[model samples]
Target: MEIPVPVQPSWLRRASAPLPGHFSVLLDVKHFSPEEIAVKVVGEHVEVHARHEERPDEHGFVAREFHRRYRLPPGVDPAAVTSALSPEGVLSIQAAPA
Candidate 1:
């Protein structure tokens, strides 16, 4: 599972990085909705392709990973979606169970 993500900037690493050996990148996406959503981590640096699961519907999806979208279900409320990051270059999205 060697994923080649955009070179994470050194500044992302903080004293309390959510995940060990990794860092957090807080992006400004207040407009992201519970429906279909995607952002191409637009940057002026060495742009890279980050592949995530194909979004099926619109509901349950949340703005996360600075790019990847976590597909949730229909029944769950939009507020139920949570976001987390790990050192393995993984964005852990906890969507409310249906």
Candidate 2:
């Protein structure tokens, strides 16, 4: 299945969601295993991707890959995604088989 972009609040500064199937996701990709990695982003133009993944030990190996485009408001560099760690709220990475 095509990974879908998640819904976000209008007032929120940034947001993220999980993907289905199998693929290595790099949120500010620190490490990457051998599996195919898919990135889902929107466009304005960015050479880099976000920092999230926190891929779980479970359900990590799955598919090939597709890196989507990413776009935010102007002046927001692609590297900004690296700062989205779950500082206040709880952040978890749970993967499921397709």
Candidate 3:
């Protein structure tokens, strides 16, 4: 008899200060839709929250929820941070000194 294997979901994250005073973050949210993700700046940290409602898949049902936060680089303005999601499901957040 053959055993059945389930599919597992995963994501990738990258954070760096690319330039003199620039901060950038890249997150892969391929399993989630654009409407299911949220980004915000709280105090000195940037937060990313995503939730995927329960749904049926090939093997079974799956639901996903994840939250991540990163501290803003020194001297970077919270109000100056910008976020954009790519066509390939990559979320990019960038900030620079005021």
Candidate 4:
């Protein structure tokens, strides 16, 4: 059996800061579109995934996929989490207190 390897494993940077009611989670999603990324609260954790489709460019072929999960914090509303993608390529997921 031949084992398949990833061409490029996308990078996922996670950061958070305390807020008045809840905290904010910042995800760095460069080289990816908002449609290719998905965030959901799974059990007691928040799952974030990014899938960059294969394409040809001046450099060469590019394909990337990444997934990361974080423990759900207290006081944070999972369903209230909102994501905003900046023009500079950053995804910000913020949530409020339940």
Candidate 5:
């Protein structure tokens, strides 16, 4: 007998339905702390990465990592991109029209 492992969908980090605004994105990062998250812009792409190092926790050892990338829209200004992490661990990004 063989056990099957769960598979992650290609749109795991992306939303299938259209968003409210053309210059905004929302990501869930409940597993990561504010200090463990990072954001960067490369060319016209915005990248977000989060990592949690091994720490003295209820578990013996734990290390988690996540990454996502979003491309800037045509009318959006890369230089004007802004991001904020909410207390509930939701990362919100906004880009204003140039």
Candidate 6:
């Protein structure tokens, strides 16, 4: 008999300050490459998408897809939204005040 290993969970984190500062969101996306991720602002919502196609691995093959959407605060500007992915696989998005 073989014991099954549990998959690691993904997580999201957010940080914000008052009207004069930036509103930020952070997500854990260690499984996907930065090129596979995208960020967009649609109306009052911020959307994130990440996809990993089937690839050969030690055990077999692995693939994953992720999508997350969040509403911007009342004073946030959609055009000012910016995003960056860290080397550690943390994706951070920020929205500036209007």
Q: For model 5, how does the per-residue alpha-carbon lDDT over 1-98 read when each residue is reduced to its tens digit?
A: 49988788886685587868256899999879888999888887889999998766676777889888888777766778898999988999888766
Candidate 4 lands at a TM-score of: 0.70
Top candidate on TM-score is 3
**Clash-forming residue pairs, model 4:** none
Whole-model lDDT values for every prediction: 0.39, 0.37, 0.89, 0.82, 0.83, 0.85
Task: List TM-score per model, in order.
Answer: 0.28, 0.23, 0.73, 0.70, 0.68, 0.72
Candidate with better lDDT, 1 vs 3: 3
Flag the better candidate by TM-score, 1 or 2.
1
Clashes of each: 2, 13, 0, 0, 0, 0
Q: Pick the candidate with the highest lDDT.
A: 3
Q: Write the per-residue lDDT of candidate 1 for residues 1-98, one digit (tens) a residue.
A: 59877877877754564664122233333343323233222232112223334444468743333334333344555454455444343434444454
TM-score of 2: 0.23
For residue 15, model 4's alpha carbon misses the true position, in angstroms, by: 43
Candidates 1 and 6, the one with greater lDDT: 6
Q: What residue runs in model 3 are displaced by over 4 Å at the alpha carbon? A: 1-20
Evaluated at residue 37, the lDDT of candidate 5 is 91
Model 4 alpha-carbon drift over 4 Å, by segment: 1-21
The superposed Cα distance between candidate 1 and the true structure at residue 95, in angstroms, equals 1.2
Residues 1-98 of candidate 4: C-alpha lDDT, one tens digit per residue: 59988565466445587686564788889878889999888877788899988988779999989998887788777788777899988888778777
The regions of model 2 sitting more than 4 angstroms off are: 1-43, 46-63, 83-98
Rank list by lDDT: 3, 6, 5, 4, 1, 2
True-vs-predicted CA distance for residue 45, candidate 6, Å: 0.6
Which of the two candidates, 4 or 6, achieves a greater lDDT against the reference? 6
Candidate 3 lDDT tens digits, 11-69:
64466877986679999998888899999999878999999999988899999999999
